[PDB]
């Protein structure tokens, strides 16, 4: 049932993720140092800016993504970047203390680090719930990279021009994920697994909207915008 075109898609996405995710987190030393009001904003701005670069590298390798116009590629990455960052951040998230552990203690982040960057509980608590619920899904890496790709190529993102071409690319990844779960994910973990993953995509839209609200409020202060990066200002807005 899992066609070889579908196995091929999964292998490309696996290779793309492994090429764009460094579990050593060695590049974190080039960021501005973590400082523990808004003391974590410079470090977290560099972290997001770095992650945006990785999401772009991953997205470029999604089968069919390049067939979109540069405009459609830009609006999809602009809209999806923070959601893909939320998804890929789950690999470092640990449920033993509800934190993102990236090796050393300096690069072990909790909720107080998010608040020390300007963000409130309106985002922080739904974000932790999302990370816990995503972790509880116990996704195969095949399902994890498929979910990130499906997230990016969504035809209902604002500013999308060729929605039907975006929909065709997503449908090929969607049928690949649906078929993968039925053939390669054994019960009971497979139970309604596709439905639970699509629900996480809905949660990501909600988390995206709340982060945009707080980002727009935080970046409205030039004193805060000064500590951001040029890439973050371009992608997330001025």
């Amino acid at each position: 049932k899992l066609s070889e075109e579908q196995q091929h898609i999964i292998a490309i996405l696996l290779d793309a993720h492994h090429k764009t995710y460094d579990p050593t987190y060695a590049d974190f030393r080039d960021f501005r140092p973590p400082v523990r009001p808004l003391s974590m904003l410079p470090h977290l701005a560099d972290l997001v800016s770095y992650s945006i670069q990785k999401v772009i590298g991953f997205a470029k390798m999604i089968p069919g993504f390049r067939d979109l116009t540069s405009d459609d590629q830009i609006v999809l990455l602009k809209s999806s970047a923070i959601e893909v960052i939320m998804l890929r951040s789950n690999q470092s998230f640990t449920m033993d203390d509800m934190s993102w552990d990236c090796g050393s203690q300096d690069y072990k982040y909790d909720v107080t680090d998010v608040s020390k960057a300007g963000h409130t509980l309106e985002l922080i608590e739904p974000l932790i719930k999302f990370q816990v619920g995503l972790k509880k899904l116990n996704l195969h890496e095949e399902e994890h990279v498929l979910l990130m790709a499906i997230c990016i190529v969504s035809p209902d993102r604002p500013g999308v021009q060729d929605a039907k071409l975006v929909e065709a690319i997503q449908d090929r990844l969607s049928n690949t994920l649906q078929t993968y779960i039925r053939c390669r994910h054994p019960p009971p973990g497979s139970h309604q697994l596709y439905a639970k993953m699509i629900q996480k995509l809905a949660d990501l839209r909600s988390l995206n909207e709340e982060h945009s609200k707080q980002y727009r409020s935080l970046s409205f202060q030039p004193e805060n915008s000064m500590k951001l990066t040029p890439l973050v200002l371009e992608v997330f807005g001025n």
């Binding site: 670069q53 772009i56 590298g57 470029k60 540069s70 590629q73 830009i74 990455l77 602009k78 040029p230 890439l231 371009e234 992608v235």
Partner: peptide, 11 residues
Amino acid sequence: KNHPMLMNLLK
């Protein structure tokens, strides 16, 4: 609006 840094990373 133009996104030159995004466009460059998209190579």
